[model samples]
Target: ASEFTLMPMLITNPHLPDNPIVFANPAFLKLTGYEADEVMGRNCRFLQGHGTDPAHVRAIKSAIAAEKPIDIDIINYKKSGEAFWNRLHISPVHNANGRLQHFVSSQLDVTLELV
Candidate 1:
């Protein structure tokens, strides 16, 4: 959990009703300009805005439904409502019993790259 301290990362509980975010690293906080208190227990979908593509949203939904890893680029918003390009990677984490434990996601601010 402490491995990627410098990188934007978060963990979500799939067992929860809305798949709320359980943990978020400092990097994620800095990237989104949000405090831990403001983000914890909320669905990451809050980052989506009017410009957020529905196709990309569908892709994420499909990957999670299949419990598959996904690497994709999508637009997400910050706490200040500023949109930025996000290169997101997500994978399903499992427990020893082979049950889906959580979904771990790493994000990169790719706004510069897109420009």
Candidate 2:
């Protein structure tokens, strides 16, 4: 049985530019075993860990530098150090006057579905 109820809400990073996570739903945290405090401010790279794909990381960096939205399927590790298929959607948020506000990233675990 599940231990917690899943809830969806916006989360802001305190240390890194106060980036807002639009939909870090509770299911996401439960699946990854990460609380809001540990997930915020830290790059998704923390989930990448040892077997992370360098090419994928580079592509993401390039996209961020260009301030573009990118969607890709890649591998990522969970807080327990277990690897899984991660579908990542990342985009740059802008203010009303077109100022770059922050980067928002969302991830989905597709390991079971794929395999």
Candidate 3:
């Protein structure tokens, strides 16, 4: 289902050691200017940079810890060091047995909208 989307999407496994990003679609790589190999198995928070708001970061962290969905606009830097306004919608995914499996995030570049 995720293989054919132009929208930037990624999924992280909370069961992993550091809740690392396990899957990132091709559009996500285009948005972040990062190769799949570079981002795979890394924490998504690494996308946050100097311009990122601490409050926003805290909010995201809190929501993830609580296993809740969150929608927020925050500054996220690309691999080339360019910062963009990222409108992020993150949601938790559960298995058929009701066990938490992963967190999926869909991101939109909203820099122009904010400007």
Candidate 4:
């Protein structure tokens, strides 16, 4: 079965050591109309566009800077320019020695609950 039908899962940003995803998951892609390849290596900020909340972006950045795990709820856009609420769980993936390896971000579509 396609993962999209399961619950919308995405693994992106495999380029930079802390590759930030523009988006992920089949459901996300379907709702947003962006291919996986196009979103990888891009920052999620693209989803913010003109209406992006700077405070939310700053908070996410702050968490990354602190190397702390964070869970946040924010509104983001799809490739098709539709907006939805996303529950984002972000954490830093570490190496064996506890060194920072990469940033992994998982998103859950929460539009149903919020809107």
Candidate 5:
């Protein structure tokens, strides 16, 4: 295999007071059935469905406080309100200036898996 951003990825500006979404990859748009315009300026929390666990949210908060990477699986809903198992991995990336750059979220839809 080659190197690439194969899975859905999103970058958000956690440094901002609102922490709005800054960018979302094409795969992310396809996975969530949302347009680029519809995706920006909004937090990914909007995708949280009924099954979304608050514990994971707290984990994220703690990770941000510690500035570390975190991998979590959360039930996220699509634009049409369809449920899916989203294997989400979140990490905070910084620049050479030691300033918080952005929060990168990589997503994988582990929908069907069997031998």
Candidate 6:
């Protein structure tokens, strides 16, 4: 069962090194331009391009480390190298056993905006 409508979403294993992505919804594929197989065990850093800011990266990293929800507007690049602004929202997901499981994220394509 789902609590919300399907959106661009991914689940990454925080226990694993680099928090490798374990799952990505269909909406995520449509947003990232990545084939499901291409990104299975990788963090979506490829989405960070030259236009990406170091501060935003660090903030998100820090948020992950703290297991806190954060909202940031960041410059992101799509698979074909098109630059866009992304409204990234991250929150921690824990298992019923009260163990940290995933860093879930949903993104909005804010391509025509300023960050």
RMSD of each: 1.9, 4.8, 1.7, 3.1, 3.5, 2.7
Top-TM-score candidate index: 3
Q: lDDT for each of the candidates?
A: 0.94, 0.68, 0.94, 0.72, 0.85, 0.85
Instruction: Give every collision pair in model 4.
Output: 9-25, 10-25
Clashing pairs in 1: none
- Which digits, one per residue and each the tens of the lDDT, describe model 2 over residues 23-98? 4556777768878777755555676767778888889778877979888777887788888988887777777998
Residues 1-115, model 1: lDDT tens digits: 4555798999999888899999999999999999999889998999899999999999999999999999999999999999999999999998899899999999999999997
| Candidate 3 residue-wise lDDT at 74 | 99
Model 2 per-residue lDDT at 38: 75
Q: Model 1: runs farther than 4 Å from truth?
A: 1-4
Ranking by TM-score: 3, 1, 6, 5, 4, 2
Assess every candidate by TM-score.
0.94, 0.74, 0.95, 0.77, 0.87, 0.88
Count of clashing pairs, candidate 4: 2
Distance from true location, Cα of 26 in model 6, Å: 1.4
Candidate 1, poorest ten consecutive residues by summed lDDT: 1-10
List model 5 lDDT by residue over 1-115, tens digit each.
5344768999999877767889888889999998989989998888886778888878877887788999977778899988888888988889999788899989988755310
TM-score of 1: 0.94
In candidate 5 the C-alpha lDDT for residue 94 amounts to 92
Model 3, position 1: C-alpha lDDT score: 50
Candidate 3 lDDT over 1-115, as tens digits, reads 5465899999999998989999999999999999999999999988999999999999999999898999999999999999999999999998999889999999999999998
Deviating ranges (above 4 Å) for candidate 3: none
lDDT of 4 by residue, 1-85 (tens): 6434444545444346555664577766665678888776777667676666789889988998887988988888887787888
Q: In model 3, what are the clashing residue pairs, if there are any?
A: none
